[PDB]
Amino acid sequence: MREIVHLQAGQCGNQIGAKFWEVISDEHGIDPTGTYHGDSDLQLERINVYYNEATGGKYVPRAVLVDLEPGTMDSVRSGPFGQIFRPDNFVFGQSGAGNNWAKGHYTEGAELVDSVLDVVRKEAESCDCLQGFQLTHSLGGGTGSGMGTLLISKIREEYPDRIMNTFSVVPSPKVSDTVVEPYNATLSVHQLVENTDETYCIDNEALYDICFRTLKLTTPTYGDLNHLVSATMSGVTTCLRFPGQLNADLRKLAVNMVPFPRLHFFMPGFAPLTSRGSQQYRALTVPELTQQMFDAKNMMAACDPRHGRYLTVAAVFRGRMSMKEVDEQMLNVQNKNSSYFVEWIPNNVKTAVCDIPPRGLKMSATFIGNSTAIQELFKRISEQFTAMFRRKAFLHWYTGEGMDEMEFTEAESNMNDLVSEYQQYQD
Amino acid sequence: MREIVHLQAGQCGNQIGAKFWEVISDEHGIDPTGTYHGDSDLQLERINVYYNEATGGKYVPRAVLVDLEPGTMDSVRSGPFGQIFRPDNFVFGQSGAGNNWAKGHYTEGAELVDSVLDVVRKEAESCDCLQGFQLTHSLGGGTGSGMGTLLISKIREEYPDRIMNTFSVVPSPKVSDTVVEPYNATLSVHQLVENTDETYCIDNEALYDICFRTLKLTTPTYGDLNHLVSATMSGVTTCLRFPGQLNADLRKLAVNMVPFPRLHFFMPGFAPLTSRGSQQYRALTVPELTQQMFDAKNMMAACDPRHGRYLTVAAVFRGRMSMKEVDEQMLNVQNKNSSYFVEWIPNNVKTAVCDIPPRGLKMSATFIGNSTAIQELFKRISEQFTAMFRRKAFLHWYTGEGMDEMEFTEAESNMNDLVSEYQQYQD
Amino acid sequence: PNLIQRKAISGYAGFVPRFAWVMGMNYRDGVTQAMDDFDKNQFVFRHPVCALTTIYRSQGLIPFYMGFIPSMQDNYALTFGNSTRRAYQKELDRRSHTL
Amino acid sequence: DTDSLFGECRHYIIHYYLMDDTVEIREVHERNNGRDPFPLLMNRQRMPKVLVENAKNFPKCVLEISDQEVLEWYTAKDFIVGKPLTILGRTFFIYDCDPFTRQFYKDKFGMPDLPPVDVTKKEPPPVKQELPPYNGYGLIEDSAQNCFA
Numbered sequence A, B: 001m002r003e004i005v006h007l008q009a010g011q012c013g014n015q016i017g018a019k020f021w022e023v024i025s026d027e028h029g030i031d032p033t034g035t036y037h038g039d040s041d042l043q044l045e046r047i048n049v050y051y052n053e054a055t056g057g058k059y060v061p062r063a064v065l066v067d068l069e070p071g072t073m074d075s076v077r078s079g080p081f082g083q084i085f086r087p088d089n090f091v092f093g094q095s096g097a098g099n100n101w102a103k104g105h106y107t108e109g110a111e112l113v114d115s116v117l118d119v120v121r122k123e124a125e126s127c128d129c130l131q132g133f134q135l136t137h138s139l140g141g142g143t144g145s146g147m148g149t150l151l152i153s154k155i156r157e158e159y160p161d162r163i164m165n166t167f168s169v170v171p172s173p174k175v176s177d178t179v180v181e182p183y184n185a186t187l188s189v190h191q192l193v194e195n196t197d198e199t200y201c202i203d204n205e206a207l208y209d210i211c212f213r214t215l216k217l218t219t220p221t222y223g224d225l226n227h228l229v230s231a232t233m234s235g236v237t238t239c240l241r242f243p244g245q246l247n248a249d250l251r252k253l254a255v256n257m258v259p260f261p262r263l264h265f266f267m268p269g270f271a272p273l274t275s276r277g278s279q280q281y282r283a284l285t286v287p288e289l290t291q292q293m294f295d296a297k298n299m300m301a302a303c304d305p306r307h308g309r310y311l312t313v314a315a316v317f318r319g320r321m322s323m324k325e326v327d328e329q330m331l332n333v334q335n336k337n338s339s340y341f342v343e344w345i346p347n348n349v350k351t352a353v354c355d356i357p358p359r360g361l362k363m364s365a366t367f368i369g370n371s372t373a374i375q376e377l378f379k380r381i382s383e384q385f386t387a388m389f390r391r392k393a394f395l396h397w398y399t400g401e402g403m404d405e406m407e408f409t410e411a412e413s414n415m416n417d418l419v420s421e422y423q424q425y426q427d
Numbered sequence C: 001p002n003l004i005q006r007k008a009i010s011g012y013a014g015f016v017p018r019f020a021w022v023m024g025m026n027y028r029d030g031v032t033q034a035m036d037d038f039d040k041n042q043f044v045f046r047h048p049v050c051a052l053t054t055i056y057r058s059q060g061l062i063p064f065y066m067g068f069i070p071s072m073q074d075n076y077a078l079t080f081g082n083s084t085r086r087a088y089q090k091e092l093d094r095r096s097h098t099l
Numbered sequence D: 001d002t003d004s005l006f007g008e009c010r011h012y013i014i015h016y017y018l019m020d021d022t023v024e025i026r027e028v029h030e031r032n033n034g035r036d037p038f039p040l041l042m043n044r045q046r047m048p049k050v051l052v053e054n055a056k057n058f059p060k061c062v063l064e065i066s067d068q069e070v071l072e073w074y075t076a077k078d079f080i081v082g083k084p085l086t087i088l089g090r091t092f093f094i095y096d097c098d099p100f101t102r103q104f105y106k107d108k109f110g111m112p113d114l115p116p117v118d119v120t121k122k123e124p125p126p127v128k129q130e131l132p133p134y135n136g137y138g139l140i141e142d143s144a145q146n147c148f149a
């Protein structure tokens, strides 16, 4: 059959992966003990997209966690579902990275990449033929980029024929508490834009915004933020796991959404956010679903796409709809703003429709869009890079690590080329 | 279909809308919670004109509550049915109006107009096709006037093919407590006449007069004031939502009502008022219905038309009537005073009958008459403006906003032009 | 009722309750079922002061089916038709966590 | 509110104002409940319990209820812990009082004891993971420490 393998890197990964796997376990109704309490024939049918199976019924995940901080994995094992993780899979190290990209890229990897590659290949021989691997890392997170660049670079030529889903949190345009974060981000994004095929870029500022918009619980927990993002990402995966009239393949999605080799960075979009009164006070229907769905506020990734224009938009739907209403909704929004698409490519919409709704809610969806609303993000990070390489402050750590400034120059050149490339294809 | 969305503004308009909404819900049969008790097929048949539909058998109003003051919105929500309105529409702010129309019209405008436009247009494309909107506010009310100016001035252009009905209560000829009231009122009316089409004018002194006349209960509340005015516009709106033979379109009414564009302001009048013994001491005869209808005591808006002359009179009836009696009663009244109907156009009567009696009494009606009886009102208010503009007292706040006296001058010029042509068309 | 409640006269320029939810079929059956829901919820909130899997059937399944039901591979050496049909009963006994 | 589709249970506070016999309904904005910052539910005012049937001459289309119509208002004599009470199409369960309340009632209205009833909801406990039994290749005491975390 066809299957996927999950990689959990950095403490952003150590966060997400735990929340995400327990979300999917609740979706397929697996108890924390790991023994199925049958409710859904079909989820028994397609639990095999992610979960292998062992004598006694237990449902192992096809994921591997990786980090350098023993305390964090101790905490996640102290979490409710740590028993749904394997001692053999627990690959780790003796040292703390110090959150230095070069430390993660040249020295500490030399005693862990071998083990992690061994793990991934034993799992690959276990499975039949993967559609590919997905990764949860942070592009500015200390250990995440250092480990991830190396492992993705190796696995690329290891398996040149698969789907490398990459998922990263964008550094806040206002708050990081990490001061070498611009340096780490630029260094990482060089190899990222070289190698990857698809990347979702998310930030926490819009998560806080949406918390004060529709969560309306004032002080949130980062775990709840993880709930939201994991909901998004499960949703984008839901195409494979279920029957119904749709087109599951992520490869379908890629050819449907990618106009050129050097476009990878896309911005998630979620479906109804329901709050205190709205549970009694919403008419859950296709029209309002579309309305709130394409709202410049309910998007959560980077920034308002207003200043730019949308290139391609794909919508996954979930529920007992009919395609006529989605067709007319798409036409209506097309005419509403026929100014903010591009005559370059007409009818830039893609639709998938699954009949197996999520639990606790009936009519829902997930959105993905590639627009020209990323120039400002990598712009800001580029000019911060300029301002701080101006005097090469703090450079001593990386120089002693043993990297060189020509790498900085080449990476910034590639980012400048990205800026231009985005600019001309829409302006 | 073809529907309406309501606008309430101003602290009085808050009470107005609260009572009016509770009256509508009462006559349509919706319980305090919102799960309606099925008794009346027709009132189930025609509720999509106002109420929208969500799950759980509830029926939300499409009303948007705008305010600056937390306490007022808190009370009105705390009222008997506040659970029927939506936090979505509970758009508010944190700064007092200062009862300064300049403050309410420029400095506080920009930060609200965006959000209020957002909500109103979301409801707009939620619905199919407006006839228009009724906007209930107070030209004598600071927040109401200030916000109404901007809201109407913007709402004009986007959707200029609809009906922007307005309700406002004229300041008392004897007291206003607010002393900057004349300034606020003229600053509102100058754009009222420029933009809108139909306005219902009312004054509270006549309400107190009628309290002494027939209400007789010696301890009234603004609750009862709202009660009676709500009865009035409920009556004017009764035509749309029921089966029967009559035209219902407010546009039909307007084109029947207004000869020249510059005239927009009209004086309503209501149908039987009753006292404790009369409720069974009274002969429910269409003749005395017409009598007490046309009686000057029964009027409650501005003053006695006995000074002025009528231009257009339209009375809409509700109950188990027939045509011929209202016809011949019109005959009787026209003959009785034919010298007081302008030679300009005879047959200035407009009739229509709905056949569903209100719950509690079978024969009822409502009346609107455009007559040249507002000269007293605007002449007096003009002398007040002039006699407090002689020495520009109480003007430093306005200068601190940054206004200039010219606007006052041209607004007064417009108002006097209205005075002149008002006098000329009938003299 | 009056005239008909099972149907509300085709091309009904008036509206009905229960517009969302069960929908996407022909008209008259929708009318019947929707008004059935409109009196169901009615009495449900009335409730006056109460406080006062064809995928598999008898003979198993067709060859070349995918989707892991529990076991198989752990047990083997039988014709797949049998294997499926015997799993059809031992999914009640030892892997009885299938429902 | 479990009768409705997405309903739940909450808890509120009733203040009987002696000095005017008015009633009120408070609220519990504890935290992170989704609910909007909002003090009240129903304001302090009068409540008509039982009315007459001939308010056709006095329809709700005109002046609301008054002395001429009400059969009886909600007396303080009606509030009793241990039986549901209905208001504005809502029926409530009263469970707890205050020491001052239950001593005021024992003399003024002459009321015996009514203890509060535990209206809370409970759950059983779970159990810790034990040891996969002696594989035969280890040590019956050391393998325990080994196979924990």
Ligand SMILES: Nc1nc2c(ncn2[C@@H]2O[C@H](COP(=O)(O)OP(=O)(O)OP(=O)(O)O)[C@@H](O)[C@H]2O)c(=O)[nH]1
Binding pocket: A009, A010, A011, A012, A013, A014, A015, A016, A097, A098, A099, A137, A138, A139, A140, A141, A142, A143, A144, A145, A169, A222, A223
């Ligand atoms: N689980 C969890 N993750 C968080 C929390 N708050 C922030 N994060 C994110 O996790 C990011 C870094 O994750 P990693 O990729 O694991 O970073 P790292 O290379 O392992 O090491 P550092 O970046 O130095 O922490 C931070 O930049 C935060 O944005 C939180 O409260 N809980």
Ligand SMILES: Nc1nc2c(ncn2[C@@H]2O[C@H](COP(=O)(O)OP(=O)(O)OP(=O)(O)O)[C@@H](O)[C@H]2O)c(=O)[nH]1
Binding pocket: B009, B010, B011, B012, B013, B014, B015, B097, B098, B099, B100, B137, B138, B140, B141, B142, B143, B144, B145, B146, B178, B222
């Ligand atoms: N609700 C209410 N309003 C009254 C009453 N008597 C007079 N009014 C007037 O109706 C006006 C309309 O209220 P709003 O339009 O909300 O007034 P505002 O914009 O907040 O500014 P102010 O008029 O200075 O209060 C009030 O300002 C009062 O001047 C009354 O008994 N009840």
